[PDB]
Amino acid sequence: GHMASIKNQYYNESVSPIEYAQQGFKGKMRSVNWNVVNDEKDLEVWNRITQNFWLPEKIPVSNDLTSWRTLTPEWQELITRTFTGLTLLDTIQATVGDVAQVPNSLTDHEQVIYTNFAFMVAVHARSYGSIFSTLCSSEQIEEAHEWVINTETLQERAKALIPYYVNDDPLKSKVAAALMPGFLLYGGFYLPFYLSARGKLPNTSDIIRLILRDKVIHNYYSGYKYQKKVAKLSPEKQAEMKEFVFKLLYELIDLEKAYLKELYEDFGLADDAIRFSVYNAGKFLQNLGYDSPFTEEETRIEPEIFTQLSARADDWEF
Amino acid sequence: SMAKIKNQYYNESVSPIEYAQQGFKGKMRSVNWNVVNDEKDLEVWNRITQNFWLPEKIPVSNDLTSWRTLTPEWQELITRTFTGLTLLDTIQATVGDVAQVPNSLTDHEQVIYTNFAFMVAVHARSYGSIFSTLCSSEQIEEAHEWVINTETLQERAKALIPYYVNDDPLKSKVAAALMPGFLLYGGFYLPFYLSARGKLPNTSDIIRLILRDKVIHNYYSGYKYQKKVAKLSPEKQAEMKEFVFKLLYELIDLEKAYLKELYEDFGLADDAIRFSVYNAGKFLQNLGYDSPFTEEETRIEPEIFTQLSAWEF
């Protein structure tokens, strides 16, 4: 014969504060448990993003003044406009998009990871201001803000993701949260890399690479959480979501092409920046578990640009 | 413009959160970190970002010797107290501070509250970091079970949440100041009591880093409260003052009951309550009101205040 004979039961008996509110102020609230992490990926991502904390003071942007002064007023205007347009997209993501992901989290740890994302995107936006403080006149700064509000091709991109963040479909909101860091700013990042490949504004591109180090993780993590939810849904629902991802991406690509053509119209950069953008559209799809349909020609990046994009972002410490 | 007004684009546009709130209307502007509408926002952004820290920077393993001199009952008290603080930080990080973003007066304030939320998440994560070093798995789990099942704790956790979710921004803002400004001090008394007695010095370094953030969060929410309230009619200002005092006294009652239960076997409650009420006075002052509390209601022993400002046991 033989003798006939559950840890952390409290967790199933309780709710996170967000869930308490979602349930109409009902339930026993649990503290986050950082000692028993439901998904190890959350702890990995928390560690990465917090260890990657930076502020723009880390970069000696004043060392870009010599090369900045070799640029014509038209190039300086292009840079200020491009960067103010990127600041707009970061403002959206920091104050609306990443915040909106907090209540749609699968785990308590993910809820606070998205507060880090929102804050770090605010740092991205603040970094462009630091660049402007160093390089630009007050007139250049103000004219770029005026141009941002009045440029419809830019506004249409800024408008495009906001309904998904405010409406009640958490999966579509998550797709938007991956598309912002994974795709929509790359046509603008083309510009500093084009310049730094030609010896102009090298320190600014170090800021861009610190921004990218964060954006890559934001895209990866939102895509990871998208897949975690979608994998449990019916085959019909999974196919519906794939169709939505491709539909929204293609719509964003069309808006991006129209904007970059206008933005770069005097400079000849739009065709190259569009290929750089579409290369990143393919990476975005891969981070959500899909195959890229784009051809080599549609995604071609010249070696000197790819070097700037790919270089590692690494005594001042935080 | 007749007067050559600068930055007219600002009046012709909306922030992204306002574009959402107005039914998707308006031209959206980027934040302008070169033109800061209220210079206090730049001061606060600079201080909170310069004050970034993470708990792993503090070698809590060096507290093991002194942790071991504490009885199982004292260790349980610490784990429970800190897990209760972790709950309040979880509320503020995931609900309270993020709820302040759409009620901001300036674009810069919107993102300052994202920093607040993230840093409060770091505060909550810090207690877990301490537990990883000092506590057994059983101590950690039992404290979580105690948190969900202790009604006096839950009533405080439940008190402020409706203001963050409902649609009165000033009442939400009062709560956002009350959380860092009042509700956790009854708990913070314990590590300082222990550190005044030479216990857990590295843990008290973490507590001081948390406090350095909380003081600013309380100050800033109170500053923004006063900015909006000063524009209200005298009768609406009076209604708001009555709300502040009523909610505070309610939370004081919930807190006194909680601290009496928490510290009952240790004889710390009366001192911890005076420590809590001292900061209640500082909360009222940060909202522009006079503290009605007496010196005896707010008495902090000099050993405790030194920890704040850095035979019986």
Ligand SMILES: [Ca+2]
């Ligand atoms: Ca070209």
Ligand SMILES: [Ca+2]
């Ligand atoms: Ca006593």
